[PDB]
Design a binder for this molecule. Structure first.
Ligand code: HSM
Lengths: 282, 232, 338, 57, 209
């Protein structure tokens, strides 16, 4: 490819990485500064922001020279990149699942949710469990499958050779999270709908709630389904390991785009975080 | 207000004892407690300290590692568990309550003490004399010295004056070198420069006789002066 | 005898207005125009006291110029060390709704009151190691909006029942009652000599009282809305009020008329608090638009702005040495400026 | 009979505050000006104080 | 030591805010307020604290405040809801009592400090209203009306003129309840209507609405 085109692509990808870093840096700054954001939702937003921020700081900057400028990763460097990337992505997915669970609890058991006393220890336990499961899903298989890789230098995880491992990983990191998020969002909508001139107001409010929940679920699914399905299909046809097509690379980038999108949906739509941002920026 | 201790007595060397200090009539949980001892006819010697809430604990190296200061706020009790009791541990240990906020008097009340007998860097504070004969109605001046300056950047000079009348426990007179304690006649006064301090008593009365002590609270371990006695 | 008696009232009011205008030779802005302007005042936030979890309604400096109390409707009355930003005390209150708080000029007591119609007195120098309730003054039928100690023994309070009262704290009874207002009394300010005080009420009038006698010496009008704040000039020959019509006014006690108005076209909000600097050259006013404006008190110029609060500034005080200014707000924060 | 009594009290008090003497505002305005020039030097907020004498740095 | 005292105070101040954030603050206005207060009295300003189904409520009755409400109404910004009490049986009484309640209801409902605060309307004394409606017409109160003499239609007309005074629509709800003194459902209705307020507050905070 031409040098000018490669430079342009590198600039665009660096811009994307900078945006991913910056949104989550703003979220973390607001959390640390306000000190009125010590509710459970705030801690979960902080966890998600940390995961997306470290996606921005590590994965994409390492990716740019490897792909566009042909920098050759070391074997240990490739292992580190793969482990960190998969851990962070699954951590973002599981943070979204935890946020959805928290909102479902707030809507379905509002009395118990409000009167319940939740110490910082339990919140930290939930966050650490999210990170631990995010690791357990992917890392223990990446490290084990590193041996399976052929002599040729390929930085895809080894288990890509076997399709059942890919299916299990996608099930534990995509299908179950999607089903849980759909269930929680549908239950939130059902709560509002059961609660519901004035009938026009109720209809409009229910439509807005449905639109918001559908937007969240659809963004998550659209970002995470393409690459997972592409990988599973190519592995089933034995094409997973080898040259990548343009559509495959776009599907690869969709997940990092989700990491970019998460700050603007969950934190930025919350009014307490909005107040914190306004105070900091004014 | 009342601090009453117990647990003293005669013990053989190598043993261990536990002293108690039950509080009565004040917000015990809001006070930092000290243990202060005074060997027979020698002088005062600070032992240890436990903060309000049990956050901080301090010891004097003479006893660090063998003692421990523990607290029981719900029961309003302060303990001193002592182990490996040498002969030098013979002394009258006192329970002293301290509270530290801006403007407080942190050595205001002392317990009655409990006698413990065992069978057979730091700021040095020196009191010039050990006995001063005088008659009632005459103004007297006591003085003591420090190694460091007790004057802080705050503008506070952490020097305290006590008075242990014959047969009684110490009573605070001056805190931070110029402030009269609560319930003491206004004839006492304190002044200094940072390393040289003095305590002036105008119109001396009969009951103003006893050993005067000058203590620094600038830094730990807390150190007492030798002790100046007023004779009559 | 109602119509002719009332006509006599109007005739005497007209005579009063003629007397005030007769003695008014020249406006204050004509003779003070020869003074050099203060210039520009930039005060930095030196401390930020953050322990309150609700709106802050009142604050008062101790005469030490280092200690200050604040009252929030989270039910707490906090004493601060403004040098080390430490918390000296935290006093829980029986009723959460407090609208005022005071510090005894000796430093041994703190007073507060609000929607319960009771002025409670707290002892800060108990031998048992805690702040107790020493007295509960219950004589008002309306909420308590201000209270200030004269000494450790007697205190004066304003109330929403349209009256001010002087109390004996040892007995707990009103020594004298000050009556004559028509609306709620929102603020009072003790004179430096503590023999006179001024009170502003919701009838847009300020009245000067004699503590020992119990009578109106003078009445001051001119504000178009409720007077929320009032403060004495340092020499005690004048006072300044802050009203809901987005104006502050300086009233002279000798001339018996207003001296100048501190208003700006871009300010369309009510004044919540007013204060003077140690030299009486700076009138510090808290505003409902979330910031405090510093006014050149002799030239009626805005010399600076203390814009550091997220909600409206409820209270405003200056130390007895003039070293610092404290501002509270509904954003739950007190800030010290210098 | 209550309304007239309230008005009667109003007239008596109003007459009392009319009888007092008033000093010309040009003289009383100068008194505020004079007090400010006398105490100007010892006002930390008006005349900025170095960071050594400032207890809030 | 002094700095360590300030931190111990912060610990207990912040522990008090957590406890005070788990309580439902209700502002009681109105009439029949004493009936409502005595109905949920399980445990200047009169504060009633009661507990129902694991929720702690604090009612603040400002009836004995003869002062300018403009001065202290903002003190109650942040309450979960306002309980407004109206007596149905007081429309032929005296200008008109039912129009004094309507004048006050419009004041608080459209108040700027209470833009997001839901109102729980209690239309009290329905037993005395159904006896006077058959005895005296409602035209004495509302000159414009059709269902001259019937409890169901007259009460519905009254309830409609209170919820039509609400100018903020979709910003807050009005939960109207018909209540005789003998009623034994009032606390449940407040709990049911408060739970709706809490849930809508959670979804609004998340930006979902
Ligand atoms: N979650 C597997 C790593 C990846 C795919 N796309 C972006 N990053």
């Amino acid at each position: 490819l031409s040098l000018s085109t490669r430079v342009t692509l590198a600039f665009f990808m660096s811009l994307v990485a900078f945006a991913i870093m910056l949104g989550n840096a703003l979220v973390i700054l607001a959390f640390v500064v306000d000190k009125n954001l010590r509710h459970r939702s705030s801690y979960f937003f902080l966890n998600l922001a940390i995961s997306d921020f470290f996606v921005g700081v590590i994965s994409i900057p390492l990716y740019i020279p490897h792909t566009l400028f042909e920098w050759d990763f070391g074997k240990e460097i490739c292992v580190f990149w793969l482990t960190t990337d998969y851990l962070l992505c699954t951590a973002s997915v599981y943070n979204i699942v935890l946020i959805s669970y928290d909102r479902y609890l707030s809507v379905s058991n509002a009395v118990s949710y409000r009167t319940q006393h939740t110490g910082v220890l339990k919140i930290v336990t939930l966050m650490v469990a999210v990170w631990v499961l995010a690791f357990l899903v992917n890392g223990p298989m990446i490290l084990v499958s590193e041996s399976w890789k052929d002599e040729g230098s390929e930085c895809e995880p080894g288990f890509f050779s076997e399709w059942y491992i890919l299916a299990i990983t996608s099930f534990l990191e995509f299908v179950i999270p999607v089903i849980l998020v759909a269930y929680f969002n549908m239950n939130i909508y059902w709560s509002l709908w059961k609660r519901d001139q004035r009938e026009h107001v109720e209809l409009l409010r229910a439509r807005r709630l449905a639109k918001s929940l559908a937007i969240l679920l659809g963004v998550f699914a659209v970002c995470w389904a393409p690459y997972s399905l592409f990988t599973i299909v190519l592995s089933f046809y034995s094409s997973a390991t080898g040259p990548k097509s343009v559509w495959y690379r776009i599907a690869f980038w969709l997940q990092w785009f989700n990491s970019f999108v998460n700050p603007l949906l969950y934190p930025l739509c919350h009014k307490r975080f909005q107040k914190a941002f306004l105070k900091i920026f004014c | 207000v009342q601090l009453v201790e117990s647990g003293g007595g005669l013990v053989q060397p190598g043993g261990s004892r536990k002293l108690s200090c039950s509080a009565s009539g004040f917000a015990f949980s809001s006070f930092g407690m000290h243990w202060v001892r005074q060997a027979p006819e020698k002088g005062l010697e600070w032992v240890a300290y436990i903060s309000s809430g049990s956050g901080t604990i301090y010891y004097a190296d003479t006893v660090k590692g063998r003692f421990t200061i523990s607290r029981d706020d719900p029961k309003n009790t302060l303990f001193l568990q002592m182990t490996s009791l040498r002969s030098e541990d013979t002394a009258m240990y006192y329970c002293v309550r301290s509270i530290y906020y801006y403007g407080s008097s942190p050595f205001d009340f002392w317990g009655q003490g409990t006698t413990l007998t065992v069978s057979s860097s730091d700021i040095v504070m020196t009191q010039a004399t050990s006995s001063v004969p005088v008659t009632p109605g005459e103004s007297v001046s006591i003085s003591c010295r420090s190694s460091k300056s007790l004057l802080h950047s705050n503008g506070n000079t952490y020097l305290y004056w006590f008075l242990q009348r014959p047969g009684q426990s110490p009573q605070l007179l001056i805190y931070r070198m110029s402030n009269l304690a609560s319930g003491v006649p206004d004839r006492f006064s304190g002044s200094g420069s940072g390393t040289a301090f003095t305590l002036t008593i105008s119109r001396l009365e009969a009951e103003d006789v006893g050993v005067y002590y000058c203590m620094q609270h600038l830094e730990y371990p807390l150190t007492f002066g030798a002790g100046t006695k007023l004779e009559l | 005898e109602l119509d002719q008696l009332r006509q006599e009232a109007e005739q005497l009011k007209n005579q009063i207005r003629d007397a005030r205008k007769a003695c008014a030779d020249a406006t204050l802005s004509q003779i003070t125009n020869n003074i050099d302007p203060v210039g520009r005042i930039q005060m930095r936030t030196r401390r930020t006291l953050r322990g309150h979890l609700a709106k802050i309604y009142a604050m008062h400096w101790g005469t030490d110029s280092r200690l200050l109390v604040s009252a929030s409707q989270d039910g707490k009355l906090i004493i601060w060390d403004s040098y080390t930003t430490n918390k000296v005390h935290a006093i829980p209150l029986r009723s959460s709704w407090v609208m005022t708080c005071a510090y005894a000029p000796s430093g041994n007591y703190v007073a507060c009151g609000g929607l319960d119609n009771i002025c409670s007195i707290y002892n800060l120098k108990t031998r048992e190691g805690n702040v107790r309730v020493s007295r509960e003054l219950a004589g008002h039928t309306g909420y308590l909006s201000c209270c200030r100690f004269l000494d450790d023994n007697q205190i004066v309070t304003s109330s929403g029942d349209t009256t001010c009262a002087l109390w004996d704290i040892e007995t707990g009874q009103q020594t004298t009652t000050f009556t004559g207002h028509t609306g709620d009394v929102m603020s009072l300010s003790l004179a430096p000599d503590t023999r006179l005080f001024v009170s502003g009420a919701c009838d847009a009038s300020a009245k000067l009282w004699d503590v020992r006698e119990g009578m109106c010496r003078q009445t001051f009008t001119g504000h178009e809305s409720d007077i929320n704040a009032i403060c004495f000039f340092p020499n005690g020959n004048a006072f300044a009020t802050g009203s809901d019509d987005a104006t502050c006014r300086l009233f002279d006690l000798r001339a018996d008329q207003e001296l100048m108005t501190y208003s700006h076209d871009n300010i369309i909000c009510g004044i919540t608090s007013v204060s003077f600097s140690k030299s009486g050259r700076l009138l510090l006013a808290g505003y409902d638009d979330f910031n405090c404006n510093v006014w050149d008190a002799l030239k009626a110029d805005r010399a600076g702005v203390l814009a550091g609060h997220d909600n409206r500034v409820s209270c405003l005080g200056v130390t007895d040495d003039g070293m610092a200014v404290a501002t509270g707000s509904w954003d739950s924060f007190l800030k010290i400026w210098n | 009979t209550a309304s007239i009594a309230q008005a009667r009290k109003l007239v008596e008090q109003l007459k009392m505050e009319a009888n007092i003497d008033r000093i010309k505002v040009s003289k009383a305005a100068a008194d505020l000006m004079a007090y400010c020039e006398a105490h100007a030097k010892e006002d930390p907020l008006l005349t900025p104080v170095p960071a050594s004498e400032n207890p809030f740095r | 030591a002094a700095v360590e005292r300030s931190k111990m105070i912060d610990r207990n101040l912040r522990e008090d805010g957590e406890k005070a954030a788990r309580e439902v603050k209700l502002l009681l206005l109105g009439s029949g307020k004493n009936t409502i207060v005595k109905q949920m009295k399980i445990i200047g300003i009169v504060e009633t604290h009661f507990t129902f189904k694991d929720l702690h409520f604090k009612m603040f009755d400002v009836g004995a405040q003869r002062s300018e409400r403009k001065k202290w109404i903002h003190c109650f910004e942040g309450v979960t809801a306002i309980i407004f009490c109206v007596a149905l049986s007081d429309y032929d009484l005296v200008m008109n009592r039912m129009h004094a309640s309507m004048k006050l209801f419009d004041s608080i409902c459209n108040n700027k400090w209470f833009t997001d605060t839901s109102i729980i309307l209690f239309l009290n004394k329905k037993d005395l209203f159904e006896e006077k409606i058959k005895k005296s017409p409602l035209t004495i109160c509302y000159p414009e009306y059709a269902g001259s003499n019937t409890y169901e239609e007259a009460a519905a007309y009254i309830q409609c003129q209170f919820e039509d005074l609400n100018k903020r629509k979709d910003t807050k709800e009005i939960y109207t309840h018909f209540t005789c003194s003998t009623d034994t459902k009032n606390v449940q209705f407040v709990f049911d209507a408060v739970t709706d307020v809490i849930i809508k507050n959670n979804l609004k905070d998340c930006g979902l609405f």
